[PDB]
Ligand SMILES: Nc1ncnc2c1ncn2[C@@H]1O[C@H](CSCC[C@H](N)C(=O)O)[C@@H](O)[C@H]1O
């Protein structure tokens with residue numbers, strides 16, 4: 648019944664808590680922001696993660712996780728359980744009033760990538776390759792998609808801070824991973840980012856209870872679901888980034904392959 652708590656989820660508060668200074672201050676190279684974008688950028692740059700269709704699971708109200716991705720997939724589908732979030736994304740996609748400002752992130756993605764691209768072009772490219780924002784539920788064996796417009800099976804998947812924040816225990820976690828994995832073409836690639844050893848995090852009046860997982864638990868989970876773990880890294884949270892919006896201990900990044908056998 649996490650969903651019950653997620654009913655009170657405030658997008659603007661979530662964004663403010665996790666993507667605005669200090670955590671949203673990309674100037675310092677030792678912060679999470681740089682780190683996250685760096686993991687994402689290096690991965691796609693290897694050129695091994697490519698295709699036509701890609702799906703972002705539990706996008707929430709954020710778009711940074713697709714910044715380096717849009718360069719490699721022409722059809723991008725973003726998703727999220729809450730309508731509030733799908734709407735918050737819409738504001739940015741259609742450049743509506745009050746949309747969130749992702750400039751710092753677009754810019755840094757451009758710096759790390761090194762193609763001399765300007766942030767305006769990357770944002771316009773991402774906006775262009777995002778075809779639709781679909782509701783989803785990782786708890787359903789068929790992720791809230793009876794007959795979804797989304798091209799299946801997607802060529803790749805990306806998920807940031809979703810699974811561990813929507814499942815109450817390690818098993819819900821494991822099963823949810825199984826659910827989304829079905830959406831992925833064999834030989835496909837998964838890019839997973841999430842909290843390490845986190846039990847709660849706020850979001851306005853919403854106070855989410857979550858499953859504290861370790862790098863090892865994540866690895867085992869990926870393996871159980873049939874992935875070869877291509878790359879798995881962890882960022883330990885510095886004291887200055889440890890605010891009162893949660894109790895994260897670190898952030899992990901995983902690059903996995905749906906092993907076709
Ligand atoms: N059953 C479910 N299946 C999938 N997503 C769910 C869900 N219940 C809640 N969510 C979504 O879980 C997300 C957790 S926060 C996710 C973080 C976001 N991807 C980022 O990178 O910042 C929210 O957008 C929330 O609405």
Ligand SMILES: NS(=O)(=O)c1ccc2c(c1)CNCC2
Pocket residue numbers: 665666670679680808812842845848893895898
């Ligand atoms: N500081 S951060 O940008 O790396 C980040 C992003 C999302 C979430 C957390 C932390 C922790 N709680 C889940 C949401």
